[PDB]
Amino acid sequence: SAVLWNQQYDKTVCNQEGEFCSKSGVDCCAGLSCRKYNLMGYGVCAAQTCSEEGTFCSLSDSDCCSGLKCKRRGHGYGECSK
């Protein structure tokens, strides 16, 4: 009754968009999201689309992630803010 070989030993490694996420609770690399597509939720990583916090955005039309508000900073231009 020999035990199967380990899957990995090295530190927590990430993968680029396209990789699949397990139900163990794995998270894609920085700037990646396992967009759910299947019925159970066996989607794959995908580069986020929403603007990050601090990045310049359109004050006329918010385009940041959930929890970010484009605060005018300058003269007719602002960036995302928590």
mmCIF file with all atom_site columns, N, CA, C and O in Angstrom, residues 49-57 63-65 68 79-81:
data_model
loop_
_atom_site.group_PDB
_atom_site.id
_atom_site.type_symbol
_atom_site.label_atom_id
_atom_site.label_alt_id
_atom_site.label_comp_id
_atom_site.label_asym_id
_atom_site.label_entity_id
_atom_site.label_seq_id
_atom_site.pdbx_PDB_ins_code
_atom_site.Cartn_x
_atom_site.Cartn_y
_atom_site.Cartn_z
_atom_site.occupancy
_atom_site.B_iso_or_equiv
_atom_site.pdbx_formal_charge
_atom_site.auth_seq_id
_atom_site.auth_comp_id
_atom_site.auth_asym_id
_atom_site.auth_atom_id
_atom_site.pdbx_PDB_model_num
ATOM 1  N N  . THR A 1 49 ? -10.544 43.204 -14.662 1.00 0.00 ? 49 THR A N  1
ATOM 2  C CA . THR A 1 49 ? -10.874 44.273 -15.595 1.00 0.00 ? 49 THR A CA 1
ATOM 3  C C  . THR A 1 49 ? -11.056 45.600 -14.866 1.00 0.00 ? 49 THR A C  1
ATOM 4  O O  . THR A 1 49 ? -10.737 46.661 -15.400 1.00 0.00 ? 49 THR A O  1
ATOM 5  N N  . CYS A 1 50 ? -11.573 45.532 -13.644 1.00 0.00 ? 50 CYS A N  1
ATOM 6  C CA . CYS A 1 50 ? -11.799 46.727 -12.842 1.00 0.00 ? 50 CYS A CA 1
ATOM 7  C C  . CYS A 1 50 ? -10.478 47.419 -12.510 1.00 0.00 ? 50 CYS A C  1
ATOM 8  O O  . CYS A 1 50 ? -9.439  46.770 -12.395 1.00 0.00 ? 50 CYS A O  1
ATOM 9  N N  . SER A 1 51 ? -10.528 48.738 -12.360 1.00 0.00 ? 51 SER A N  1
ATOM 10 C CA . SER A 1 51 ? -9.336  49.517 -12.047 1.00 0.00 ? 51 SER A CA 1
ATOM 11 C C  . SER A 1 51 ? -8.910  49.298 -10.598 1.00 0.00 ? 51 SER A C  1
ATOM 12 O O  . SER A 1 51 ? -9.745  49.099 -9.719  1.00 0.00 ? 51 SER A O  1
ATOM 13 N N  . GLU A 1 52 ? -7.601  49.335 -10.362 1.00 0.00 ? 52 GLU A N  1
ATOM 14 C CA . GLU A 1 52 ? -7.064  49.139 -9.020  1.00 0.00 ? 52 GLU A CA 1
ATOM 15 C C  . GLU A 1 52 ? -7.185  50.416 -8.194  1.00 0.00 ? 52 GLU A C  1
ATOM 16 O O  . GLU A 1 52 ? -7.464  51.489 -8.728  1.00 0.00 ? 52 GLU A O  1
ATOM 17 N N  . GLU A 1 53 ? -6.975  50.290 -6.887  1.00 0.00 ? 53 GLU A N  1
ATOM 18 C CA . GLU A 1 53 ? -7.063  51.433 -5.986  1.00 0.00 ? 53 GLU A CA 1
ATOM 19 C C  . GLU A 1 53 ? -5.826  52.317 -6.108  1.00 0.00 ? 53 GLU A C  1
ATOM 20 O O  . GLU A 1 53 ? -4.699  51.853 -5.945  1.00 0.00 ? 53 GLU A O  1
ATOM 21 N N  . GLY A 1 54 ? -6.048  53.597 -6.396  1.00 0.00 ? 54 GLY A N  1
ATOM 22 C CA . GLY A 1 54 ? -4.942  54.527 -6.536  1.00 0.00 ? 54 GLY A CA 1
ATOM 23 C C  . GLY A 1 54 ? -4.670  54.892 -7.980  1.00 0.00 ? 54 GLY A C  1
ATOM 24 O O  . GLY A 1 54 ? -4.078  55.933 -8.267  1.00 0.00 ? 54 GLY A O  1
ATOM 25 N N  . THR A 1 55 ? -5.103  54.031 -8.898  1.00 0.00 ? 55 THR A N  1
ATOM 26 C CA . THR A 1 55 ? -4.899  54.266 -10.322 1.00 0.00 ? 55 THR A CA 1
ATOM 27 C C  . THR A 1 55 ? -5.871  55.316 -10.850 1.00 0.00 ? 55 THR A C  1
ATOM 28 O O  . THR A 1 55 ? -7.009  55.411 -10.388 1.00 0.00 ? 55 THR A O  1
ATOM 29 N N  . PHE A 1 56 ? -5.417  56.101 -11.821 1.00 0.00 ? 56 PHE A N  1
ATOM 30 C CA . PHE A 1 56 ? -6.247  57.144 -12.413 1.00 0.00 ? 56 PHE A CA 1
ATOM 31 C C  . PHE A 1 56 ? -7.467  56.543 -13.103 1.00 0.00 ? 56 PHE A C  1
ATOM 32 O O  . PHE A 1 56 ? -7.354  55.574 -13.855 1.00 0.00 ? 56 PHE A O  1
ATOM 33 N N  . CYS A 1 57 ? -8.634  57.124 -12.842 1.00 0.00 ? 57 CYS A N  1
ATOM 34 C CA . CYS A 1 57 ? -9.876  56.644 -13.436 1.00 0.00 ? 57 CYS A CA 1
ATOM 35 C C  . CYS A 1 57 ? -10.728 57.811 -13.928 1.00 0.00 ? 57 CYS A C  1
ATOM 36 O O  . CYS A 1 57 ? -10.376 58.975 -13.735 1.00 0.00 ? 57 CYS A O  1
ATOM 37 N N  . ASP A 1 63 ? -14.906 53.386 -12.758 1.00 0.00 ? 63 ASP A N  1
ATOM 38 C CA . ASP A 1 63 ? -14.495 52.160 -13.431 1.00 0.00 ? 63 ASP A CA 1
ATOM 39 C C  . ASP A 1 63 ? -13.520 51.365 -12.565 1.00 0.00 ? 63 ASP A C  1
ATOM 40 O O  . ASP A 1 63 ? -12.612 50.710 -13.077 1.00 0.00 ? 63 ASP A O  1
ATOM 41 N N  . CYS A 1 64 ? -13.715 51.429 -11.254 1.00 0.00 ? 64 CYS A N  1
ATOM 42 C CA . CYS A 1 64 ? -12.853 50.718 -10.316 1.00 0.00 ? 64 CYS A CA 1
ATOM 43 C C  . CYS A 1 64 ? -13.563 49.493 -9.747  1.00 0.00 ? 64 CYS A C  1
ATOM 44 O O  . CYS A 1 64 ? -14.754 49.288 -9.982  1.00 0.00 ? 64 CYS A O  1
ATOM 45 N N  . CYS A 1 65 ? -12.823 48.682 -8.997  1.00 0.00 ? 65 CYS A N  1
ATOM 46 C CA . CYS A 1 65 ? -13.379 47.478 -8.394  1.00 0.00 ? 65 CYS A CA 1
ATOM 47 C C  . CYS A 1 65 ? -14.415 47.830 -7.331  1.00 0.00 ? 65 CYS A C  1
ATOM 48 O O  . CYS A 1 65 ? -14.663 49.005 -7.056  1.00 0.00 ? 65 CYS A O  1
ATOM 49 N N  . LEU A 1 68 ? -14.279 51.030 -4.470  1.00 0.00 ? 68 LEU A N  1
ATOM 50 C CA . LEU A 1 68 ? -13.379 52.090 -4.907  1.00 0.00 ? 68 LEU A CA 1
ATOM 51 C C  . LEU A 1 68 ? -14.155 53.228 -5.562  1.00 0.00 ? 68 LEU A C  1
ATOM 52 O O  . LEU A 1 68 ? -15.011 52.999 -6.416  1.00 0.00 ? 68 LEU A O  1
ATOM 53 N N  . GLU A 1 79 ? -8.176  59.430 -9.273  1.00 0.00 ? 79 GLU A N  1
ATOM 54 C CA . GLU A 1 79 ? -7.850  58.010 -9.240  1.00 0.00 ? 79 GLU A CA 1
ATOM 55 C C  . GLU A 1 79 ? -8.753  57.267 -8.260  1.00 0.00 ? 79 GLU A C  1
ATOM 56 O O  . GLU A 1 79 ? -9.464  57.883 -7.463  1.00 0.00 ? 79 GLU A O  1
ATOM 57 N N  . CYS A 1 80 ? -8.722  55.941 -8.322  1.00 0.00 ? 80 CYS A N  1
ATOM 58 C CA . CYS A 1 80 ? -9.537  55.112 -7.442  1.00 0.00 ? 80 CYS A CA 1
ATOM 59 C C  . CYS A 1 80 ? -9.120  55.293 -5.986  1.00 0.00 ? 80 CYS A C  1
ATOM 60 O O  . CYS A 1 80 ? -7.937  55.462 -5.684  1.00 0.00 ? 80 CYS A O  1
ATOM 61 N N  . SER A 1 81 ? -10.097 55.254 -5.086  1.00 0.00 ? 81 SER A N  1
ATOM 62 C CA . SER A 1 81 ? -9.832  55.416 -3.661  1.00 0.00 ? 81 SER A CA 1
ATOM 63 C C  . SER A 1 81 ? -10.760 54.534 -2.832  1.00 0.00 ? 81 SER A C  1
ATOM 64 O O  . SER A 1 81 ? -11.968 54.489 -3.067  1.00 0.00 ? 81 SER A O  1
#
